[PDB]
């Protein structure tokens, strides 16, 4: 899909260097090799299987996200690099950062960034139960979107709720976020 | 709409009340369901079938159990009563329709035959203590991708489990696709008995 | 008490299969944290109990496992693959038989009703909240509400027998082991 | 009242503030304390002879107030404090118990983006998990009842063990001669701020 090309020749930065460039609200994107990742890639015809939102606590970099075999969580980006989901190894796939055009000239303690984070925090849960994981992965394969205030989210549905509730509009897969004319690539992580 | 031979085979089958069927059921009978759960629909879509689930009936005396892999749960054995009155701790009937069939080879075989003993042995040997979150995701993903179980692993789609049990007593199912419930329903040796009212 | 099982004959699992009868009482002395909490609060070597159910020649154990659920599974799991570990249950294992069911055949009405009640309580796993509640009740020594379907192992074994008339003298495995009508058969080698 | 320790009197006549008013007074690092009526809460209260069953660390994201904690039937999580007031663990109701705020003496004259506060938060974040499994919940509650601390470099934490790891890694030790909420409440450097109305 047209998000493919947009990231194909983006600069490759080492993780240590990128820390200083990342801003709260930046959009994390991944192309994973996990079975669930592959289902997302097939149904959406994309190289992108995951998305989430970056949140800086001081100098510390966290990723706020819905991970479909896990939950709506907030965790250190370092996990994707060094210990993905208790494997003690790097995420199996490639990793990218982008930034939304509207938030590029907005400081980390702006009103907008505050409300974006607020909404994400409000959706943090304590893991999905077995039933819900099954339901979420099934909706991906069926291409079906979710009920009004049902709280089970595909990664991109979660990124979408947060931006929705600050006005930025984008079913919805990671591809739709990557392909969006207002989403600007920053880097692939080496 | 968009469905196969298994479907017609069960379309005008006699409707029995659960209480009446109990006496007709025999260990090795094949349970079949057409569910409305998201995972049930994914199964129905990818396999182009009304059937989302299958399992093997086991009679302990007068009591009727169902041995099965339930993809959001585990490889378990539980009372058939659950599907009628209390499906997965919901206190309500399974959201879908229910059917019973019998394999031709086991129709003239008594419940303590050596075949039925081996069928039950294998099923018992695969019961687990639930699938972990990772495994449930992987199973449901395979369904959507139409990939069979490609390492020597113990994660089973409902029909895969039923198939392993029968495989290990010499009954093979035309598993052309991988194997979904449809291939069990559609199999020439599988005869319909009833829909449960 | 404890002593009742101390010098009981040690049988190999393969040999015991033929001796077991539906309704036999399974007993364990485990080294798991939850096992030890049961052993402490009840001052006993017994951490677990359950009811044996024979499907033809095959041997199942019907039980409430406090970090899992009210389930029925092959006894073979306790010997070879306890709770997806691919190893034997970390502890020792015993069989007893209740005096009343010794002269009663496997398809008697009593055995039928014992199995009926146990089947009626099988669930699809305990939720996280319920496990915590069960383990907390063990440590607090509190029994359960008559509505509540959350069971300490021994509370489950007790309900089954209660509904066929057999009463046991809150309730931990120790009370079942110690009961004058529960006779030891074997420790599993 | 005689079945209980020094931690208790320290919080008995503390001012009662409405939640809305306390938001402005709270600072990252402040210690949350609860006296719950849940079964697990009672086991904690008995074994530790305390009115306190829970503890956690407050973390401010701008004006929004979060609580970072290990909840023993759930996980090492970070969630809005508002949940304790309006929707505790999906019940849509307030936490069943009483709630308190305290502040450590060392952090009273330290601003919210200090280097210390940064490291406290770093450690907490590093321990956030995706829920405890059924096995671990059982193990944790068992340890509480057995009064045993965590032997290996093990990641299963009683609430106060979590609060203790975060403070330990910025130099603040709590008289842990195992550790329950009581030892945090009773600590001479922990000053009561308010009970939440
Ligand atoms: N959407 C997620 C799926 C996670 C699979 C492994 N936990 C990703 O592609 O990263
Ligand atoms: N194969 C199963 C899927 C599980 C749906 C609910 N747990 C069925 O169609 O019943
Ligand atoms: N009563 C049980 C406790 C659960 C052990 C962990 N699965 C036993 O001693 O075996
Ligand atoms: N430490 C916790 C115990 C578990 C509460 C159950 N939701 C508390 O007292 O709040
Ligand atoms: Cl995978
Ligand atoms: Cl960090
Ligand atoms: Cl991770
Ligand atoms: Cl569903
Ligand atoms: Cl069920
Ligand atoms: Cl343990
Ligand atoms: Cl087991
Ligand atoms: Cl409770
Ligand atoms: Cl909560």
Residue numbers in the entry:
A (entry chain D): 0 to 169, 176 to 195
B (entry chain B): -3 to 173, 176 to 195
C (entry chain A): 2 to 170, 176 to 195
D (entry chain C): -4 to 172, 176 to 195
What's in the article?
NlpC/P60 superfamily proteins are ubiquitous papain-like cysteine peptidases or other functionally related enzymes. To provide insights into the function of these biologically important proteins, as well as PPNEs in general, we report the crystal structure of BcPPNE and a comparative structural analysis to other related PPNEs. Our results suggest that BcPPNE and YiiX are likely amidases with specificity for the amide bond between a lipid and an amino acid (or peptide).
The data were indexed in space group P65 and the structure was determined to a resolution of 2.5 Å with four molecules per asymmetric unit (asu) using the SAD method (Rcryst = 19.2/Rfree = 21.9). The final structure of BcPPNE contains four monomers (A, residues 2–195; B, residues −3–195; C residues −4–195; and D, residues 0–195, where residues upstream of 1 are a part of the purification tag), with a lysine bound in each active site, nine chloride ions and 41 waters. Each monomer consists of a layered α/β fold with a central, 6-stranded, antiparallel β-sheet (β1–β6), which is protected by helices on either side (αA and αC on one side, αD, αF and αG the other). Extra, unaccounted-for, electron density was identified at the entrance to the active site of each BcPPNE monomer and was modeled as an L-lysine based on shape and electrostatic complementarity. The lysine occupies the S1′ subsite and forms a hydrogen-bond network with several conserved protein residues (Ser48, His49, Glu67, Asp68, Tyr83, and Tyr90). One striking feature of the active site pocket of BcPPNE is that the tight fit of the binding cavity around the bound lysine at S1′ renders the catalytic cysteine inaccessible to solvent, suggesting induced-fit binding. Side chains of Glu67 and Asp68 interact with the free main-chain amine group and the side-chain Nζ of the lysine, respectively. In this conformation, Glu67 occupies the position expected for Tyr127, based on comparison with other NlpC/P60 structures. As a result, the bound lysine seems to have induced the rearrangement of a short loop (residues 66–69), containing Glu67 and Asp68, which, in turn has displaced Tyr127 from its (expected) original location. Thus, we conclude that the ternary complex of BcPPNE may represent a “closed” (or inhibited) conformation of the enzyme.
